[PDB]
PDB file of C-alpha atoms in Angstrom:
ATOM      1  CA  UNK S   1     -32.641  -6.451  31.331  1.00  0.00           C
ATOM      2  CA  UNK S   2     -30.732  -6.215  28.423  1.00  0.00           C
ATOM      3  CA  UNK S   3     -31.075  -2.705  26.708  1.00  0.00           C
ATOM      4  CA  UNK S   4     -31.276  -1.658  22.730  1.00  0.00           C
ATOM      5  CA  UNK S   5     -28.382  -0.431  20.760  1.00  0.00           C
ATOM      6  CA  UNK S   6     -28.078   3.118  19.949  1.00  0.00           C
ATOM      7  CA  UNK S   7     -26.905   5.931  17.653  1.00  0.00           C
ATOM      8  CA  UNK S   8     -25.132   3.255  15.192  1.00  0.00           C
ATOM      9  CA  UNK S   9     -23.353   5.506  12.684  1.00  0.00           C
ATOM     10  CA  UNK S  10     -21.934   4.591   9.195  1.00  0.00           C
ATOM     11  CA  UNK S  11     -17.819   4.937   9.205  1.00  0.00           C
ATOM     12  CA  UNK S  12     -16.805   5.027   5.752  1.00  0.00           C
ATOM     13  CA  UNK S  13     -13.967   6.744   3.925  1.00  0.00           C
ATOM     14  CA  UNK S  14     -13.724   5.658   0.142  1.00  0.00           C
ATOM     15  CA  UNK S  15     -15.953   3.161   0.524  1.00  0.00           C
ATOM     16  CA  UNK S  16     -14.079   1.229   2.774  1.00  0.00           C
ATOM     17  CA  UNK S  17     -17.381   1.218   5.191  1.00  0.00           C
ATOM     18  CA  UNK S  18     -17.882   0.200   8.835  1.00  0.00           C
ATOM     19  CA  UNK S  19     -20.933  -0.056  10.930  1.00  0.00           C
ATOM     20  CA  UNK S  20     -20.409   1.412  14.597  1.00  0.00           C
ATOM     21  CA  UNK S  21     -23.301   1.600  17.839  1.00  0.00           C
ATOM     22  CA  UNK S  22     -23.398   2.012  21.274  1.00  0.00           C
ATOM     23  CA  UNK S  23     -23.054   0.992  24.267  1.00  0.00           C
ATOM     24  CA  UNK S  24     -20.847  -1.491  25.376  1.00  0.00           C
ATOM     25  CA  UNK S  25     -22.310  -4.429  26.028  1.00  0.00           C
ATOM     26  CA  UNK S  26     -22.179  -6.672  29.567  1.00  0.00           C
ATOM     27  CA  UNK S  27     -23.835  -9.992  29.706  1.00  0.00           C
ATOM     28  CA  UNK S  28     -25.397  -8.816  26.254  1.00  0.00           C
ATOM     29  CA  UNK S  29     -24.485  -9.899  22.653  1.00  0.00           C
ATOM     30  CA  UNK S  30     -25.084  -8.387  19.374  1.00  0.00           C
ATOM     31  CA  UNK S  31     -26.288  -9.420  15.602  1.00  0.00           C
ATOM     32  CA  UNK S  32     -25.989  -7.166  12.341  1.00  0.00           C
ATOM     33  CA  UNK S  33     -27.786  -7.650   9.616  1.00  0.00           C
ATOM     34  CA  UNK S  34     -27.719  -5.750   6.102  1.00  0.00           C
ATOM     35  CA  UNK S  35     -30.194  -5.431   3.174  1.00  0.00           C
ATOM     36  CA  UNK S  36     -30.616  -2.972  -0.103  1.00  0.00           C
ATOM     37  CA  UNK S  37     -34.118  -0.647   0.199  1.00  0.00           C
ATOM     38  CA  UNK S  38     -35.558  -3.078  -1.941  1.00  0.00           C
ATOM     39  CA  UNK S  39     -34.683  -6.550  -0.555  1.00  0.00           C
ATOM     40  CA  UNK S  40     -33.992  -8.799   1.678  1.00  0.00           C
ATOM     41  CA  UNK S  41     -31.812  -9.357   4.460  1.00  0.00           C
ATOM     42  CA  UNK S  42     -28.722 -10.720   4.722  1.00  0.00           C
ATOM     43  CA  UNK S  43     -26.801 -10.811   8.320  1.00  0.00           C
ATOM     44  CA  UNK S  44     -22.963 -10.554   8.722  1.00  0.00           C
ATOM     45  CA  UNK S  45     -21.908  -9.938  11.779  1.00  0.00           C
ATOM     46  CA  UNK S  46     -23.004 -13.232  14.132  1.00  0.00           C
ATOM     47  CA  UNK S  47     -23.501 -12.648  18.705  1.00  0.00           C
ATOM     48  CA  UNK S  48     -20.581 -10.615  18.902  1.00  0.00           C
ATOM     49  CA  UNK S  49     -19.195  -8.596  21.915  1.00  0.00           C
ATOM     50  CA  UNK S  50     -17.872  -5.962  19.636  1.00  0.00           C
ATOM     51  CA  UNK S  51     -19.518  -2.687  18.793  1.00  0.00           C
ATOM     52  CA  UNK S  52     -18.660  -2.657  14.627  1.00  0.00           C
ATOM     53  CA  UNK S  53     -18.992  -4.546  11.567  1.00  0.00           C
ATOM     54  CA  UNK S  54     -16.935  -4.589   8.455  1.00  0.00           C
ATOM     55  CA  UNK S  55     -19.748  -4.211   5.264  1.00  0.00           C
ATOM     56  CA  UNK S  56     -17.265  -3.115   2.706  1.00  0.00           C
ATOM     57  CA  UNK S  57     -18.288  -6.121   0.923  1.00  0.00           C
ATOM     58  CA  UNK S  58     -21.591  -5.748  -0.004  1.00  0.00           C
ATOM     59  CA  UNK S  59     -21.527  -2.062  -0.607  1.00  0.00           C
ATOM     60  CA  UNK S  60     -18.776  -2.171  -3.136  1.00  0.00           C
ATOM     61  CA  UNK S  61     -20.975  -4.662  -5.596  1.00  0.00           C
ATOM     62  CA  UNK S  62     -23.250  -1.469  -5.960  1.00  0.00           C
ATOM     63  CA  UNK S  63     -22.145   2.131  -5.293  1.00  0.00           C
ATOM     64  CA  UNK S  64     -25.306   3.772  -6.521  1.00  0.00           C
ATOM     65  CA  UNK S  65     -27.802   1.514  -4.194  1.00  0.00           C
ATOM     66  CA  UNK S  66     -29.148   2.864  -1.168  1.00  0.00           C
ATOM     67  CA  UNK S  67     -28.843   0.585   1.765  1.00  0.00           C
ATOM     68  CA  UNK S  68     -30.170   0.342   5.720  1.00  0.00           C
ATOM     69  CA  UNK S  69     -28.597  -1.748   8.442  1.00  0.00           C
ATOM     70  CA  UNK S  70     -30.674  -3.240  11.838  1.00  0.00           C
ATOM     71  CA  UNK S  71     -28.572  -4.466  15.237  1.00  0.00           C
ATOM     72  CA  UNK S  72     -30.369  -6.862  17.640  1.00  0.00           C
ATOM     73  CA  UNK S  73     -29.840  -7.491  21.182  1.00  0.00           C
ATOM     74  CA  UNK S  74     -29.591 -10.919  22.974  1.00  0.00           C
ATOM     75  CA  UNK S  75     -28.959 -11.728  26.942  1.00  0.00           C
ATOM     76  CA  UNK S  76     -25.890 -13.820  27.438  1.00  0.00           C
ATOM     77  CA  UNK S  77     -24.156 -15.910  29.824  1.00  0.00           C
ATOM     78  CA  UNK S  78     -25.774 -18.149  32.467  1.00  0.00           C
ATOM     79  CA  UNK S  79     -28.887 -16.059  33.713  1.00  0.00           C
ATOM     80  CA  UNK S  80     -36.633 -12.974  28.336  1.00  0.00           C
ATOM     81  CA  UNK S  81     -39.174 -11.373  25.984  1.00  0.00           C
ATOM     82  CA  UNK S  82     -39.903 -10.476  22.506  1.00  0.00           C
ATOM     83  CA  UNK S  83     -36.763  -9.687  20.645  1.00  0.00           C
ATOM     84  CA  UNK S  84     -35.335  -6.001  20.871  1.00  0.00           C
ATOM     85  CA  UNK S  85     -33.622  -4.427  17.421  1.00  0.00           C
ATOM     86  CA  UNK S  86     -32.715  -0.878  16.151  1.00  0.00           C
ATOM     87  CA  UNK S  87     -32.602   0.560  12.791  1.00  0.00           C
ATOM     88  CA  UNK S  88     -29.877   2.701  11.380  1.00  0.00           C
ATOM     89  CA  UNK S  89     -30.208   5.924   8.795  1.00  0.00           C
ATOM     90  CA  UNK S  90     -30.191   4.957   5.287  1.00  0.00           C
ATOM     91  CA  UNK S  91     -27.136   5.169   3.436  1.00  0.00           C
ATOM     92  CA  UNK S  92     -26.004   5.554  -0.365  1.00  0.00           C
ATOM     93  CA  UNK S  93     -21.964   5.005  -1.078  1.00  0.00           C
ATOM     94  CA  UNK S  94     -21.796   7.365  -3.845  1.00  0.00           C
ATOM     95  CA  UNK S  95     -23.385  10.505  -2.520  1.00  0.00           C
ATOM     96  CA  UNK S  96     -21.978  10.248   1.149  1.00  0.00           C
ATOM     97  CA  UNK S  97     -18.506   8.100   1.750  1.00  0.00           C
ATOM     98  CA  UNK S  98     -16.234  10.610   2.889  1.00  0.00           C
ATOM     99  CA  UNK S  99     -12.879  11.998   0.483  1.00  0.00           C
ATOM    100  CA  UNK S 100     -10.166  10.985   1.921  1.00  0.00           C
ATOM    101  CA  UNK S 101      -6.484  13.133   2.379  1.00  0.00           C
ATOM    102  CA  UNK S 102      -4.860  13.391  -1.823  1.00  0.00           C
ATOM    103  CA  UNK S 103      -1.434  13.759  -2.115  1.00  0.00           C
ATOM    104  CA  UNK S 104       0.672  15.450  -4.761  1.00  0.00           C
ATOM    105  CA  UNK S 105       2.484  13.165  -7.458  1.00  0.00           C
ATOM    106  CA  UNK S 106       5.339  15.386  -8.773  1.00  0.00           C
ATOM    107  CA  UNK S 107       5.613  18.945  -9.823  1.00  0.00           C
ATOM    108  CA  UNK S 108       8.026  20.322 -12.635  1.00  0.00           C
ATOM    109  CA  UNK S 109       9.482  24.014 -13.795  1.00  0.00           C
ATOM    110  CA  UNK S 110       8.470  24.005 -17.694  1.00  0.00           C
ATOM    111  CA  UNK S 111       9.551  27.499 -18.763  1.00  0.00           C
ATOM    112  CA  UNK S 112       7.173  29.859 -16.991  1.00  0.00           C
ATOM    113  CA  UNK S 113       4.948  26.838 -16.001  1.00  0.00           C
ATOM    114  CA  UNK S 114       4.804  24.420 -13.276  1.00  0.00           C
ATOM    115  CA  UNK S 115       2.740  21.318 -14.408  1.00  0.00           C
ATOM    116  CA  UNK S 116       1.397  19.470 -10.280  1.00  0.00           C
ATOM    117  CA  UNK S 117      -0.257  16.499 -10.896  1.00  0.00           C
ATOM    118  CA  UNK S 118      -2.124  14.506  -8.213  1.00  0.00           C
ATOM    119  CA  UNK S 119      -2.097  10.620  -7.601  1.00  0.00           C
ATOM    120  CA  UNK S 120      -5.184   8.886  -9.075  1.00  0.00           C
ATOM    121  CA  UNK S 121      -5.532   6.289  -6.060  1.00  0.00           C
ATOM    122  CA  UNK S 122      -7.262   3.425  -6.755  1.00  0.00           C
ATOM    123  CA  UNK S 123     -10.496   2.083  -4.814  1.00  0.00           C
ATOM    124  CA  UNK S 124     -11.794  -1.436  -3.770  1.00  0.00           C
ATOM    125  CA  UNK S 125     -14.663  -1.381  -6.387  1.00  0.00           C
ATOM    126  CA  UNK S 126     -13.920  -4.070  -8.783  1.00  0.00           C
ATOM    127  CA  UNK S 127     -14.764  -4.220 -12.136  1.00  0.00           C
ATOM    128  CA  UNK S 128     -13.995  -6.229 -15.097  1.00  0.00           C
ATOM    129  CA  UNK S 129     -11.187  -8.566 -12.446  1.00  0.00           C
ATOM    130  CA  UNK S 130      -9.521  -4.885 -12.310  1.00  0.00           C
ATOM    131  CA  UNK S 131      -9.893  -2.102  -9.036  1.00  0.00           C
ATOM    132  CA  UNK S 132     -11.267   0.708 -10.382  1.00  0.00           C
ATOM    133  CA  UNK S 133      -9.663   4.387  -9.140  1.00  0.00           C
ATOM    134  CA  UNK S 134     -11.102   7.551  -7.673  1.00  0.00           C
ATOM    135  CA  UNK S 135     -11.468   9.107 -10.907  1.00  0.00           C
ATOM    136  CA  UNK S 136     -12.703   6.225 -12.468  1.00  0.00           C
ATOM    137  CA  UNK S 137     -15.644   6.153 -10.095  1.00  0.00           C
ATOM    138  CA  UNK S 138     -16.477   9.864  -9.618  1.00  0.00           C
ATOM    139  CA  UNK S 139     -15.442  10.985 -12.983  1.00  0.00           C
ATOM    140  CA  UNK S 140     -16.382  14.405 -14.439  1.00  0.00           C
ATOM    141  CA  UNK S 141     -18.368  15.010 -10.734  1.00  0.00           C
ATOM    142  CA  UNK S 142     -14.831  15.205  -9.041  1.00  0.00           C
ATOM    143  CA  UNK S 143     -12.576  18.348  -8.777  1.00  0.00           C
ATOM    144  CA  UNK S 144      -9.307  19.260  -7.697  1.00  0.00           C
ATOM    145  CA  UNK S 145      -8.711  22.891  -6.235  1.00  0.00           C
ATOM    146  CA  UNK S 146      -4.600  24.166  -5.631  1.00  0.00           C
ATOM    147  CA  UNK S 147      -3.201  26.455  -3.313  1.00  0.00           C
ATOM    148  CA  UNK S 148       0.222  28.421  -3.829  1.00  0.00           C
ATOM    149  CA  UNK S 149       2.037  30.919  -2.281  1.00  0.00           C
ATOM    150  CA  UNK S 150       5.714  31.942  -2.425  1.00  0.00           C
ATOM    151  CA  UNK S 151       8.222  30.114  -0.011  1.00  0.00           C
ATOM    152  CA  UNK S 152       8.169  32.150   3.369  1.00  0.00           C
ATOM    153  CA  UNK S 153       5.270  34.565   2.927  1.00  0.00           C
ATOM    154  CA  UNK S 154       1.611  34.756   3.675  1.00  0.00           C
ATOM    155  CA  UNK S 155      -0.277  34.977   1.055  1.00  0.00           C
ATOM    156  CA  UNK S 156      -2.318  32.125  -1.181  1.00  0.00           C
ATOM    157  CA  UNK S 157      -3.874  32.102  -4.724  1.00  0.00           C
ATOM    158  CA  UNK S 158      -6.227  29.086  -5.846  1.00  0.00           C
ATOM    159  CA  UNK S 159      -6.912  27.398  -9.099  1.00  0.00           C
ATOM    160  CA  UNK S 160      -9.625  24.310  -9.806  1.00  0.00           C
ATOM    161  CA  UNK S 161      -8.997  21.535 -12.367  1.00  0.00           C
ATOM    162  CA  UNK S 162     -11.270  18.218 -13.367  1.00  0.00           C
ATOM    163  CA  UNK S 163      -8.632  16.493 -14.997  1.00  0.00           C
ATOM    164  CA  UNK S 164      -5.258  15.099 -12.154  1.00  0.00           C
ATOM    165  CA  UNK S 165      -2.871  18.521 -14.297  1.00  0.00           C
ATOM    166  CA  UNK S 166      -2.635  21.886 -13.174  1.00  0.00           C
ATOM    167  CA  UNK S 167      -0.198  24.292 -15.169  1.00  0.00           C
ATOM    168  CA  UNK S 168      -0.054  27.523 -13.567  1.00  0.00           C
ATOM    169  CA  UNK S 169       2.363  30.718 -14.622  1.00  0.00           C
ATOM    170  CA  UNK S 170       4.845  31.134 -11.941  1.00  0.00           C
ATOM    171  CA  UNK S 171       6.604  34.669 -11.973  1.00  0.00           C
ATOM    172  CA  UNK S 172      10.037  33.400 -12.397  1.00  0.00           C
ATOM    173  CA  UNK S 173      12.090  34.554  -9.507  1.00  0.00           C
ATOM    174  CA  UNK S 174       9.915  33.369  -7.380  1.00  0.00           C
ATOM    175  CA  UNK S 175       9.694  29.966  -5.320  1.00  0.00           C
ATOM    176  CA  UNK S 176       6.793  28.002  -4.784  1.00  0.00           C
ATOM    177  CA  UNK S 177       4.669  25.992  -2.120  1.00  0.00           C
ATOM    178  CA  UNK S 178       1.590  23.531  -3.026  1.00  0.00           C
ATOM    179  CA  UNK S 179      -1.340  21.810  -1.122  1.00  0.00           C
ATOM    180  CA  UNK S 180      -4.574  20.307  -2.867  1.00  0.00           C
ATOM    181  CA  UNK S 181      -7.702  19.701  -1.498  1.00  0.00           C
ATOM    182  CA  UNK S 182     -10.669  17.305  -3.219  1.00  0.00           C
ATOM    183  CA  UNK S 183     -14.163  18.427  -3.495  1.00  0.00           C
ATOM    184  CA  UNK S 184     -17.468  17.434  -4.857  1.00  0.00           C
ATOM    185  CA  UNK S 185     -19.427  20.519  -5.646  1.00  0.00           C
ATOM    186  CA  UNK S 186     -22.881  18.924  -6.157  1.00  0.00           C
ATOM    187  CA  UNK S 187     -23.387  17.074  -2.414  1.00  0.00           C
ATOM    188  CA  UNK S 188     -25.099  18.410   0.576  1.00  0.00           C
ATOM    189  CA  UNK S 189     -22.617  16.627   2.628  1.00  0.00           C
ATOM    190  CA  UNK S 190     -19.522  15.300   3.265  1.00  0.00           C
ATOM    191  CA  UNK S 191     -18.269  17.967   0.199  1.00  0.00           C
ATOM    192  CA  UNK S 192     -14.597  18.208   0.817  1.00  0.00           C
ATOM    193  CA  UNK S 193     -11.359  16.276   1.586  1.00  0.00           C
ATOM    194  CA  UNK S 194      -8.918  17.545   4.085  1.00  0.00           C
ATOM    195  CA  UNK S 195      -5.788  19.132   2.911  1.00  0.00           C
ATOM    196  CA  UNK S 196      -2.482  17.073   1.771  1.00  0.00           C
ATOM    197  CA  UNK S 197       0.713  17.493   2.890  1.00  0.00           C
ATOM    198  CA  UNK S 198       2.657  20.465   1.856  1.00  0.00           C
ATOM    199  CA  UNK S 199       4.971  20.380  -1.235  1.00  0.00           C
ATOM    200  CA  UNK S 200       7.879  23.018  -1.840  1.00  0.00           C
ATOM    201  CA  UNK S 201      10.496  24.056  -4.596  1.00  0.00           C
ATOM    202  CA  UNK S 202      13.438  24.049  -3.386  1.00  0.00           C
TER     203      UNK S 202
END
């Protein structure tokens, strides 16, 4: 009586990716294995109790590839049939790993400008013995959208960038707030980060 696994879902942020499934298992172990649409498999995770599996690996060697996962069930412990496996949605790195939080770098008074720039983080995708960063993986396909208002009001105005600069006219007098958010216009998915953390004049 052991039972198949269910709704496995692909938890990745960046590209750091992890495989997740239900249910728990009792007197029941698991096996995941991983393979590109066009290829062969190649299993990782070897009868475990646990209900994840760490692929980063093998999806960071090729961002662009679209790849499919399978979990099988076994009986364990001292206690039949043809074996019992699941299938998980298809999934390609580029188009769906989720943006995680940015964070401003620095922001400086340059007459009536402020120039914010944002961190370029960098990834796990190697290349050439060197990480490559956010922007170096997304390039021109990546933009940055920022959101000011004055100290203690209520009211915010937006501008969009595809470089990590801003420079926007501040009305001298008065004192500013920031927040960016990331976003990938072209998806029909995970499009947007969440918000960083809020950066004031002052």
């Amino acid at each position: 009586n052991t039972v198949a696994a269910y709704n496995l879902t692909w938890k990745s942020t960046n590209f750091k990716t992890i495989l997740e499934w239900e249910p728990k298992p009792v007197n029941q172990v698991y096996t995941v294995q991983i393979s590109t649409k066009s290829g062969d498999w190649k299993s990782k995770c070897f009868y475990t109790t646990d209900t994840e599996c760490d692929l980063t690996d093998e999806i960071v060697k090729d961002v662009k590839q679209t790849y499919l996962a399978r979990v099988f069930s076994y009986p364990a412990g001292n206690v039949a049939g043809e074996p019992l496996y699941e299938n998980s949605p298809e999934f390609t790195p580029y188009l769906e790993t989720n943006l995680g939080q940015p964070t401003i770098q620095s922001f400086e008074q340059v007459g009536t400008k402020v120039n914010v720039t944002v961190e370029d983080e960098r990834t796990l995708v190697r290349r050439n013995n060197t990480f490559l960063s956010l922007r170096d993986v997304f390039g021109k396909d990546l933009i940055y959208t920022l959101y000011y208002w004055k100290s203690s009001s209520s009211g915010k105005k937006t501008a969009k960038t595809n470089t990590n600069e801003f420079l926007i006219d501040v009305d001298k007098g008065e004192n500013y707030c920031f927040s960016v958010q990331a976003v990938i216009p072209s998806r029909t998915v995970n499009r947007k980060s969440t918000d960083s953390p809020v950066e004031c004049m002052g």
